[PDB]
Design a protein around this ligand. Structure first.
Ligand SMILES: Cc1cc(F)c(-c2ccc([C@H]3[C@H](C#N)N[C@H]3CF)cc2)c(F)c1
Ligand SMILES: Cc1cc(F)c(-c2ccc([C@H]3[C@H](C#N)N[C@H]3CF)cc2)c(F)c1
Lengths: 405, 249, 400, 249
């Protein structure tokens, strides 16, 4: 039924020691509802009826399992290595994020919460949250930065067609990390009836563990599929890393596989030396941010540095604490991928396999090509294709001069 | 051994009044002006100053203080400017604690920041996003450098967490928030005699007076930032009205 | 082979549905495609290539989802959604293009042309061609290219070429006319990957065979989940490919109702519709004898629908036969009805349907009200409605 | 026994020339003007007139003829207008066959269209989108009403299909190719039958007509006559004169 907890944090939410990564860097005003969620999840994660409910929605509603596809026409560009694409792009709503919102929305119902709030960058997680809330009859309020609302007119329309309410965050830098701050303030005021559906594997305990658990299904399926299609465990499993949810979801089933390399690829923007990037592990340092102790991009005083990436999902200055632990422990390597490498991969996947990837996922594809060259002919590399790129066609079209002036 | 802010509340309880606790962020509208305003708070009747370290992502700050700290960070305010503000307040005969989110402290170095704050004449530290569960380094530096540690309790605090937060505090415990505030103070006083400050969006003498009925300290932040924005004279006026409010007789 | 046409492509014998109403200049490549299909139809290598692609590339099987929050709006019937919207590229069209593109490479053809209206079949064809290394040229109506820039960019990103067709009325039927002329001139190296279950033999049969997997899965899945065969299976009908796909496995189930819902636009009484069976008549069009919207002289008349995929004046010949045989009923659904179902499926189930598919949902809601509580209705949810979000936002006034 | 156009091609071989077969669509630029132009073709030396039925989706027609039939349909042309033109050509002593796509004939009624076409003096039917495989009804009506059936062959036609198509034809066979393809196609037909062969290559000059009269029993001109009529009826009369000169070379 439920998988063991060998890699779990302690009761305080800390990885690798009681003063290690994760924890709860939140105000006391939030600790009551956080303990309520932690206890609710602790009960339901071992409830067979809850896992049966989630499995049922994953199969008939979300479309699981997602297939594993060997991109044979990518081999030439990856040192003749063998690229297997875990096709989360085929999930309902178009990304892995549906796995997360289905779990937390079931949990909010189990808790008697009637209202769900969530943050969103360009709109991916807000649409996913509004989708689950429509399915389960929960009232939904999405917080979105005012720069992103004005720029994402149709995603606001999607969320409204799904019955959710969209609030424009016109404070701070008016983007993803300020939407998160606005949702945090909403929860502090409305903890009695409101559940905060967090969008990645970060935040205070138990959200890094909970989100990772709702995404473990990716790695569990992929580990069976890659053995059936390639005949052995892969030489490497790679994924892109924004907050970390899709990477940790596909990494987890392979942690105790000693020969399987685990590589996460993060957004280098214009270049890690330009200061226009989101390469958290590559250029950030440890610090407390958004409820956990992890890596973030910060200046000499501890202030958050604004990140930049051609992708929205990787455009986040922090990263989840379980990745920080895995980095420190040497289990996973984290490497940067520029805007150009990703767009290069984005286009190559369109022409070679007919799959339009999310620009977030193109970073992982790009890194997979580089890894194939390093590992050489015949290497088996599993890639998490975290989402489809329909949301990114306009951005890619402009990049490749397909819209003109 | 007694806390640094202990005698301040004793003196206030002797004079049948609450301690007036005023907040201002460093560097708003600039570093000199904020230091001039913090000095004016000492000169106008503030028993304790809350020197706020402006933070890029202040989740607990309301819009008035959020806009002020955003402005202060645009002006290039630094964490070391907060230490200098504390030295100014000490020189002016004031009593300063520092209110800061934890990440600047982690970045500075927890023991280093406690040391330098104590040397600067600081008396303690208010930590709105640091709960006792994560305060192991801070508690050790708090004892090493004789700094008070003001944690926060909330209306929704469970009986277990409220007692733990109060037991971990020194100086006063910050009760942040119809009748929720006095009920919260009652719960703290049901388990401890530690002074309790109340933040309640105070912006008038009458509100300050109501809180002084049940609280040991009245905390005023947003209203001072608004008064400072109008000008230093308005800030002196408001603080005098608040100093009158905390006094019952 | 039980419901298959004769060697000439005719369904129903003397009524003569289907056939080959094409010029002699095209009969050599049409006989080549027919011969190539009947060979690979029974080739185990071909079937194994297709099943592998359908499974690992397209994501088959698609699930069957019981939309319980729709029940109160369907007379307490039980609406099951056959989730073709979850396929790669987001509709059933991937089923057709995978089969035909594999055929084209088996045939030694190096070029694939295809028509498209708003861009759905064009993106699907370019997708399959990118996958198999085939050169791809999409013909699209000039009125459509002008307002579908992102779909054109999708095709270009996939490595295809897009040709805007300014002849005729610059719409879908005119893109088909232009792709026809291309095939006449380039039949040596070109395969015409047609987009629906119409055209001359073997295209109505072949396309249906590539879509049959929908009905076969759905018939297994509905017995598994509900414990019995459904009371009705419904689908929207443009040219007929997604309807014939889900209908076929149920054809010899005598208790299963089959209802295709066609686009009635502003209303059948208004002359701004696409209700081929409701308001059209038998005629020869686009290589087949079937139903189409025509005037007294047999000229094609313009079709109208808020849905782009149902905005086609014709319909496949196997549907005309099944209508004549009484096996399937064809009912009209208006713009308003479809859009009301569109919004309801968004609010109730969190599924954003293609406006084409919302016609079928709208028809299922009416059919559940008349079949009563507990009736099981399988609806083919042919596509997702991402492409339609802007159309639907305007309709419900959510912009500005 | 013999075909209706048999005498026309007999008279042409006896005068050492190919037949000039001219096409125009009914109702371009309007119905009376088109009839005036078709009468002018008979006067200017056309041996056989192809009265075209404008169709809303002419797949086999090029841009010059498709835009003319678009204009004719925009003008409101009806299928009955084509039969009135066939009657006018007949009364003027001309020899008229109708070229049409098959759906307007299905809409009219195949046997009714053949009857009314025969009654108007029409001699045959050219059927570009009707292959013999679908010509059961047409073959019956073609015999009942004594009309020639002019099917098309193509450069790509298979040996079996060319023989079958030539065998089902009566009057002549339209060999369509719109440099060495057209004469080879006529060679393939004459190797299996003696039926006359018409050729359409977008003829627009006197020299192009003579090149084709060297091997084809008839020279078909369509697009050039439409373009000439657009300029004016005198330009049509002139060009048709030059084409009647080319076929005798
Ligand atoms: C699931 C979840 C829950 C959370 F509470 C938060 C969170 C925590 C703290 C903050 C505030 C903090 C304070 N006060 N300083 C701001 C930025 F860090 C904002 C958001 C989150 F990011 C995800
Ligand atoms: C796969 C496929 C193959 C086809 F040949 C056609 C087709 C056939 C005929 C026409 C022509 C006809 C003539 N000549 N008049 C036009 C309109 F009908 C156009 C297209 C098609 F639609 C799909």
């Amino acid at each position: 039924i439920a998988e063991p907890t060998s890699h779990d944090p302690d009761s305080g939410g800390h990885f690798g020691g009681p003063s290690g990564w994760g924890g709860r860097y939140v105000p006391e005003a939030l600790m009551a509802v956080i303990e309520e969620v932690t206890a609710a999840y602790q009960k339901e994660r071992v409830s067979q009826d809850f896992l049966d409910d989630l499995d049922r929605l994953q199969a008939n509603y979300a479309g699981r399992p997602s297939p594993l596809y060997e991109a044979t026409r990518l081999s030439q560009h990856a040192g003749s290595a063998r690229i297997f694409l875990k096709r989360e792009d085929l999930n309902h709503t178009g990304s892995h994020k549906i796995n997360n919102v289905l779990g937390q929305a079931l949990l909010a119902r189990r808790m008697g919460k009637t209202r769900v709030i969530a943050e969103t960058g360009a709109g991916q997680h807000g649409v996913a949250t509004a989708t689950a809330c429509a399915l389960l009859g929960l009232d939904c309020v999405i917080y979105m930065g005012g720069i992103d609302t004005a720029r994402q007119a149709l995603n606001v329309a999607r969320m409204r067609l799904l019955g959710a309410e969209v609030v424009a965050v016109q404070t701070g830098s008016k983007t993803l990390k300020d939407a998160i701050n606005e949702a945090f303030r909403d929860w502090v005021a409305n903890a009695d009836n409101t559940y905060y559906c967090f969008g990645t594997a970060a935040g205070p305990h138990p959200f890094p563990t909970m989100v990772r658990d709702f995404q473990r299904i990716i790695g569990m399926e992929a580990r069976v599929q890659i053995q059936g299609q390639a005949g052995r465990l892969p030489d490497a499993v790679v994924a892109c890393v924004g907050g970390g949810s899709n990477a940790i979801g596909i990494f987890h089933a392979f942690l105790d596989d000693p020969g399987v390399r685990l590589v996460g690829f993060e957004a280098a923007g214009d270049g890690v030396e330009t200061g226009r990037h989101a390469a958290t592990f590559t250029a950030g340092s440890p610090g407390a941010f958004h409820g956990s102790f992890s890596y973030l991009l910060q200046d000499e005083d501890g202030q958050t540095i604004e990140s930049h990436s051609i992708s929205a999902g990787l455009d986040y200055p922090g990263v989840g604490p379980e990745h920080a632990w895995l980095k420190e422990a040497g289990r996973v390597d984290y490497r940067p991928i520029t805007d150009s490498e990703a767009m290069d991969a984005f286009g190559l996947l369109c022409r070679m396999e007919g799959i339009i990837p999310a620009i977030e996922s193109a970073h992982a594809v790009a890194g997979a090509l580089k890894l194939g060259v390093e590992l050489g002919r015949g290497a088996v590399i599993v890639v998490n294709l975290s989402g489809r790129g329909d949301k990114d066609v306009e951005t890619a079209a402009k990049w490749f001069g397909l819209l003109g002036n | 051994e007694a806390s640094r802010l202990g005698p301040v509340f004793d003196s206030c309880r002797a004079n049948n009044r609450a301690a007036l606790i005023g907040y201002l962020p460093t560097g708003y509208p600039d570093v000199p002006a904020s230091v001039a305003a913090m000095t004016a708070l000492v000169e106008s009747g503030c028993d304790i100053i809350e020197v706020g370290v402006p933070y890029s992502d202040p989740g607990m700050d309301g819009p008035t203080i959020a806009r002020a700290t955003e402005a202060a960070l645009r002006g290039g305010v630094r964490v070391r400017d907060t230490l200098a503000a504390v030295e100014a307040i000490s020189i002016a005969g004031g009593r300063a604690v520092v209110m800061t989110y934890w990440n600047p402290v982690l970045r500075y170095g927890v023991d280093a920041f406690a040391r330098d704050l104590a040397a600067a004449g600081g008396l303690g530290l208010i930590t709105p996003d640091l709960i006792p569960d994560e305060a192991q380094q801070w508690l050790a530096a708090s004892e090493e450098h004789r700094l008070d540690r003001i944690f926060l309790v909330a209306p929704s605090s469970t009986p277990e967490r409220l007692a733990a937060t109060v037991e971990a505090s020194r100086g006063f415990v910050y009760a942040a928030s119809s009748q929720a505030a006095p009920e919260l103070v009652g719960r703290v006083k049901a388990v401890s005699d530690i002074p309790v400050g109340v933040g309640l969006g105070v912006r008038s003498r009458a509100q300050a007076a109501q809180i002084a009925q049940y609280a040991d300290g009245v905390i005023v932040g947003s209203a001072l930032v608004t008064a400072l924005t109008e000008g230093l004279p308005r800030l002196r006026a408001l603080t005098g009205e608040l100093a009158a409010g905390v006094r019952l007789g």
